[PDB]
Design a protein around this ligand. Structure first.
Ligand SMILES: [Cu+2]
Ligand SMILES: [Cu+2]
Ligand SMILES: [Cu+2]
Ligand SMILES: [Cu+2]
Ligand SMILES: [Cu+2]
Ligand SMILES: [Cu+2]
Lengths: 333, 333, 333
């Protein structure tokens, strides 16, 4: 088919955990969906101690933004590597077929750009990440990863074939960082990326992250940046981990319908407490809130959550249901 | 509905791996099921070397006891923190909805008690654990976790909708401990919980357990405390891990029907050799024994099993079936 | 039934990643399928640096060869431990029922052999491994493991009950090695297995592999030993990990149908990007190639893949499909 006869629609991306507007049920036929991302190498402070790393980002954020299309749309990405960066980058889409997910076709030095097109033939949430030959884990674990959602053309379905429609969607990217340490255990102070490379490799080879964070930093999805919902709202939380297993859990809630390995032709798992998202995968969980208040959303390795950073909050408004839960006798002597 | 019009039934809990008597198919309408647990801080010897830790327990055991109710029963827990303990505790039920699983409503200082009620709206096996704000992984990884089973009102079903009925049930709680080590590798000798806290945090942050045990100690489910069955018996093994992934395996057997992430509205996985239970989850495996003798039940990271403690035994009585397995030629020169 | 009335067929095994010839759909009734394996202890170089270990193998390879039978065949294995070896060995089949998978019946000292028979009552791919009492993880993590495939008698089926037929099959065994290190981080230089045992145990207890490899060495499934396919070919990749979780991914492709925990009575998961195979399990993924070129097949902990060894290649011949993927604008200033 002549792709030039298809509609083109340009998407304007937004910063995670928010997601660009889209339709769950496709209101048009197949389209070429046009995205642009600009790579930015930048310093990021990732914890409360002030630890600063040299992050590698798509569009200035860790994670990169969530892209949303429908099955059998074409994704057309303009990828820009400005001359203010210093490294070679590319992109691998797990949604795509061929050429190492796109990475063999998208190598851009500083001062270069490229445009890749692929057909999104399989529905699901998928990781995307940089993958420069010989340096792959360093770029990924420096923050250069995000996700793409390929919706079925008739939207999401439950285990019986009935529609599932979310009211709100959030994208939680979880990032394992490997900040090199000296013998005494302090994070090393590097002058350039090349001077950092061997100790970055050493640090990665321990297989022990120093930090595991949501949306790029300890505490990023708390306080004024907590996730929000109301009682009765249907929320989809897309969660990705490009390099290491995670096990999300909504403290005080559930995943009512979960695609733990993210692929919508499969029926969802029901009523999950915790789900395993393997490293290199995106998953999605659908929940209808039933109680107001604060919820924590965590990796349920609780050390990873509360000591290394993999914890966010929901603030949920509405009525308390004392049938579902109540304090019969409040704490007392 | 006025909960005061419902029947009340008091459960008397038992020490894992045994489980309090219950009905698989509910013989009454919904009930308020009353449980009591008393928190006990105590010294426990956890390995053959004599390593002694300061454990934090529900009802004196690691894991805490298995609670069993039916879907849409109400769980009413009296939680007691006697004045002989020194820390603040609470409880989070993954089965419950709201208030951080109950933790926001159940904070008890030494000398206090509380009573929580929640509706068990989802069937499955679920973790429960202590979760005091700011100290969550320390309490969990000190042993303060167990599980609750919410049975469907019409009992368990196979992948085709046919009944599955167990003859025996066991609860295996798997505990990762993080005993702080000095530089030379020996376990440190602490005077109070507050003096221990920073090195406990340091130890946890390595993400490398020093011990991984069933029922609270190396060897706990061996010898005179081996699990038992007879050929032809249907056994359900509930397995929980509140903090870290595990992968159970019955050496010489299978999981004929497994809910690896523990939720009974989902069809079970058939004929599993090994299953992944993510950290923060309870799972359940159903097996009908076909051969007598000794079986080992392990985490099939065999280092975790045989070097760090995550191994128990079954002793199974009955007839040997030489059609299913035989030695044709015994070892010989 | 009198097993002596059944046909006997002798299989001649082949070196992984290749697989002995077999039929997907059984062309005979149940058979006794006769296998022989000879244990070989040997030095193996496992990385590009020249690190040499004392490996323990079935039939001279890491992994041991893939055995293939049909459901309700009998597997009859002659296991030979020649007098040129120095250790006691045995075998545990996860496909088998009873006697610790066979291990209690197959203990062979150097200079001994044995013959075990078992009925393959459950379809799926399964691990087999050595398991000598008290030394289990050392033998497994020295390479003494492989897999067995028990096909349904009417071959593989999709999630709807329709046939799935592969054109090619490969067996990828993934091996975690724990080469002891000195304080400075270099691999130690041992004189005998007994002198090595305590530092092997120490190394294993770190839970941090020094090497994670496919087919026995870094790079083993690259270059002249890359896996091969053509566009349009249906390929089954069987992947096992006897001791530690892995998460396979085909870079530039998918698992169209995946049995992540390897058991064919279950419907496959569709359209997977990455799948979790728990330690102690074999899994299988079915893919139809749609694009030519080089693909990498990896554990998608990318550190494990690209820094520790868990990466292979496919070389795929055929036509490029520019509808599925194209470079619209090649990299340029
Ligand atoms: Cu990059
Ligand atoms: Cu990838
Ligand atoms: Cu506590
Ligand atoms: Cu929890
Ligand atoms: Cu051996
Ligand atoms: Cu095994």
């Amino acid at each position: 088919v002549d792709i030039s006869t298809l509609p083109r629609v340009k998407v304007d991306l937004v910063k995670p955990p928010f997601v660009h507007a889209h339709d769950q049920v496709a209101k048009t036929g197949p389209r070429v969906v046009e995205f642009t991302m600009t790579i930015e190498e930048k310093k990021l402070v990732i914890d409360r101690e002030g630890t600063e790393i040299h992050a590698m980002t798509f569009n200035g954020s860790v994670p990169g933004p969530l892209m949303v299309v429908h099955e059998n749309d074409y994704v057309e990405l303009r990828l820009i590597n400005p001359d203010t960066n210093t490294l070679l980058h590319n992109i691998d889409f797990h949604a795509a077929t061929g050429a190492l997910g796109g990475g063999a076709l998208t190598q851009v030095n500083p001062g270069e750009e490229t445009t890749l097109r692929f057909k999104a033939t399989k529905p699901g949430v998928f990781v995307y990440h940089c993958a420069p030959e010989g340096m792959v884990p360093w770029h990924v674990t420096s923050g250069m990863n995000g996700a793409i959602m390929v919706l079925p053309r008739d939207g999401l379905k439950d285990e019986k074939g009935q529609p599932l429609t979310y009211d709100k969607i959030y994208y939680v990217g979880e990032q394992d960082f490997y900040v090199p340490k000296d013998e005494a255990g302090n994070y090393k102070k590097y002058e350039t990326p090349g001077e950092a490379y061997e100790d970055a490799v050493k640090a990665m080879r321990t297989l022990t992250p120093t930090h595991i964070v949501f949306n790029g930093a300890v505490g990023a999805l708390t306080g004024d940046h907590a996730l929000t919902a109301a009682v009765g709202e249907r929320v989809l939380v897309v969660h990705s981990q490009a390099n290491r297993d995670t096990r999300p859990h909504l403290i005080g809630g559930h995943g009512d319908y979960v695609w733990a390995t993210g692929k919508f032709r499969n029926p969802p798992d029901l009523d999950q407490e915790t789900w395993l998202i393997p490293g290199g995968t995106a998953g999605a969980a659908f929940y209808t809130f039933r109680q107001p208040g604060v919820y924590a959303y965590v990796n349920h390795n609780l050390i990873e959550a509360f000591e290394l950073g993999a914890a966010g909050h929901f603030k949920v408004t509405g009525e308390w249901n004392d049938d579902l839960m109540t304090s019969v006798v409040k704490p007392a002597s």
